[PDB]
């Protein structure tokens, strides 16, 4: 059917679950990233 899109999205769903763990486990990277976003606006 639309196999690359469905596969890529699924891969991305894992990728967000990893990001959510990284946001709390490796907290300082989002601590820097949010500070940059709040500064830049």
């Amino acid at each position: 059917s639309s196999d690359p899109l469905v596969v890529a999205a699924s891969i991305i769903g894992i990728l967000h679950l990893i990001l959510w763990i990284l946001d709390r486990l490796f907290f300082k990277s989002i601590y820097r990233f949010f500070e940059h976003g709040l500064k830049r606006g």
Copy 2:
């Protein structure tokens, strides 16, 4: 399985990851959505 629901859902999966990055990178737009929800709910 019929195709459309599973295709729409996976597209939405990517869309939620794009929305999380959008939340931090451009704070101000989801900030208006939340203010709109607090005013009306």
Copy 3:
């Protein structure tokens, strides 16, 4: 791989995104659940 698990899981992927929109837009609904968790824990 049979249909029901993947169909339910994809439907569930939409379901979390609707729940996140709900968490901001309909703020009082999530409030009652969180209060119940704090109360007895």
Copy 4:
């Protein structure tokens, strides 16, 4: 083509939803983990 990967990713998408419920239902588990990450980083 890739049913093991697509299945595991779909299962993971449910798995994250359960974790977000877990976060505000069992608040003292996020207490014990967030304290450890604050303390040693």
